[PDB]
Design a protein around this ligand. Structure first.
Ligand SMILES: [Zn+2]
Ligand SMILES: [Zn+2]
Ligand SMILES: [Zn+2]
Ligand SMILES: [Zn+2]
Ligand SMILES: [Zn+2]
Ligand SMILES: [Zn+2]
Ligand SMILES: [Zn+2]
Ligand SMILES: [Zn+2]
Lengths: 362, 362
């Protein structure tokens, strides 16, 4: 009755530690990951302090080693001051994150020349990922070509963006991309229900035509990733709502529903939540690690999932078919039927495993 | 000084056992694989008897389990009589092999309708690979679309073929392909040296323009695979030369030379000899497995490599930079500097590992 999947990987999560632990911490965010059938996460650097230098990375690594329940890697963040300074720690990170649209004064880059400087100084064998919306996708692709290296585009959300990436791939350019579940399963049609606070997300929800273009161009999508961006309901419904949705606990149930409906195959799903994340980010295998899912159980997403401290979900009310029943991580039962069974600190930094270093020429 | 690589995978080898063991056997062919930095091979079914039914597969599995020194999976072969009969053993094979051009009376398919029948009856979640040259590439792609599933094209050798596959990928069709080293590093210019016997291979050596098109379209190539096709020198130089080159021991040195010359990156190589083979064929990770290579040592390929019983090589005289120094397979030293150190039978059938079954819906 159950289907055994390999350990799934989410390459785009915000776990809020250090500095935003009321929204989520490593322990709660990785519990959410396990309950969503995810056994490895890559955590983004827009924490407080942001992970933009070696001291901040060192702090975040110890906090994750002590709090994470699943395995992880941590991104470094590009700033207006750190190009050329990250070489000694670069290989210990998941990759480098560029925030190319509206952002915090610390990750903010004010000039494309600063993007160039990062592409030129970051080690050429290590991953670079970009938050790049609309024409910014084209712009960062140009910078990647000028510096003759690859780039990965986060959360593609629009017909415009997926078709641009499609055209770049047709020209043989080294670009990969990911799509988040809210851009496949929500649209403008849902903003009346969500309201302008809860509905705030970046990239914003697309039109029906945007959603249909992403599905029609599934072949262009290399990865799914949640962009798990937990904020409390008070923050989402308050005066200055921060953008973002929680998504770790809902991503796999949503996608399994789509598999059961024949919208994509099980293999299509596993390429995008396992094999392609591995190969783009050079993430190591996890020994004795698997996820058991039940594809027959129909349920309705409630007003909040059990684990994320966000304590809300934009998918409330959607019917899904597909449940995570059991997760085994490195030989230990990590999750069964609504209970996480590995403690904070069980998770490890995969970049410290010998098989987790990115291969490079001498 | 040494570069650590993961365990490399060759998805296209002919190991000649059962029935052609003077050309190669599991023990000698997997020694050649290890000396070439390969830790897992997928063996083709055109043996004697050919692996076209459950009894033949059972025999080949035991012979491989007893003789293989590295890990393996075995292909089943499509015949004019076995469509609809392989369902119980299909999941235990690497995949199904279709020989669509000139071949033996046992793997010979006389009608595209027989290709259709195989695409319709072989389990939809399991791999299908095709020897398909020139217009046969287009024909098998059509059959794949009619049956709405994927196909993998073996040894792409011509500008015509890579551009057709390129066009299919631009239309979002589920097709992958592999290229063999002789089609990247040899051409018509080498036939005078090789002669018409040694030079006989299928697909035949291409023109300079074919070779240049493959390099220019590297982005379209998903895998490298040797098409290791050992025949003795007596056979290659005799009256009716069989097509094929040995290649396990020369593939990685040739490609490392190209990396050192900047023709492709180390990552490009590892996508094509590790990550993409894994994800196309759902091959499991190998624990505690790695290859150490030396990228500074310049040497000239001799008249025969140490291990393959073929006892000849078409790459004789080429200068290479790159050597396999050490291979560790599942925690045991398997190869050092010209000596294989694991015995016949150390290798295992990866499809019997829990992590080596192809995931499928209930
Ligand atoms: Zn973002
Ligand atoms: Zn991302
Ligand atoms: Zn994000
Ligand atoms: Zn890798
Ligand atoms: Zn062939
Ligand atoms: Zn092949
Ligand atoms: Zn072959
Ligand atoms: Zn797989």
């Amino acid at each position: 009755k159950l289907v055994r999947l390999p350990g799934l990987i989410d390459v785009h999560v915000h776990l809020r530690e250090p500095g935003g632990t009321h929204k989520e911490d490593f322990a709660s965010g990785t519990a959410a990951a396990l309950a969503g059938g995810i056994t490895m996460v890559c955590a983004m650097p827009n924490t407080r302090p942001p992970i933009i230098d070696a001291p901040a990375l060192a702090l975040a690594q110890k906090l994750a080693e002590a709090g994470a329940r699943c395995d992880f890697a941590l991104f470094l963040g590009a700033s207006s001051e750190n190009a050329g300074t990250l070489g000694t720690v670069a290989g210990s990170a998941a990759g480098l994150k560029l925030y190319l649209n509206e952002t915090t004064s610390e990750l903010r880059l004010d000039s494309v020349v600063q993007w160039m400087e990062h592409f030129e100084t970051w080690p050429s064998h290590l991953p670079i990922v970009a938050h790049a919306e609309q024409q910014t996708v084209a712009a960062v692709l140009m910078v990647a070509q000028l510096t003759q290296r690859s780039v990965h585009i986060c959360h593609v959300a629009r017909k415009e963006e997926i078709l641009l990436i499609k055209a770049a791939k047709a020209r043989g350019l080294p670009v990969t991309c990911e799509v988040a579940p809210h851009h496949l399963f929500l649209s403008h049609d849902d903003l009346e229900r969500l309201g302008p606070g809860k509905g705030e997300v970046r990239p914003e929800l697309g039109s029906r035509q945007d959603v249909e273009a992403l599905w029609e161009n599934m072949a262009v999508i290399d990865c799914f990733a949640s962009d798990h961006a937990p904020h409390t309901l008070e923050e989402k419904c308050g005066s200055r709502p921060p953008p973002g949705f929680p998504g770790l606990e809902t991503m796999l149930p949503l996608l399994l529903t789509a598999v059961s409906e024949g919208r994509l195959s099980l293999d299509d799903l596993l390429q995008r939540l396992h094999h392609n994340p591995r190969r783009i980010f050079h993430l190591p295998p996890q020994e004795d690690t698997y996820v058991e899912v039940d594809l027959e159980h129909e349920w309705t997403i409630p007003s909040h999932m059990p684990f994320s401290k966000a304590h809300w979900t934009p998918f409330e009310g959607q019917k899904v078919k597909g449940t995570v029943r059991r997760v085994v991580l490195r030989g230990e039962v990590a999750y069964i039927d609504g209970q996480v069974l590995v403690p904070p600190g069980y998770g490890q930094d995969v970049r410290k495993w010998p098989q987790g270093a990115v291969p490079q020429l001498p």
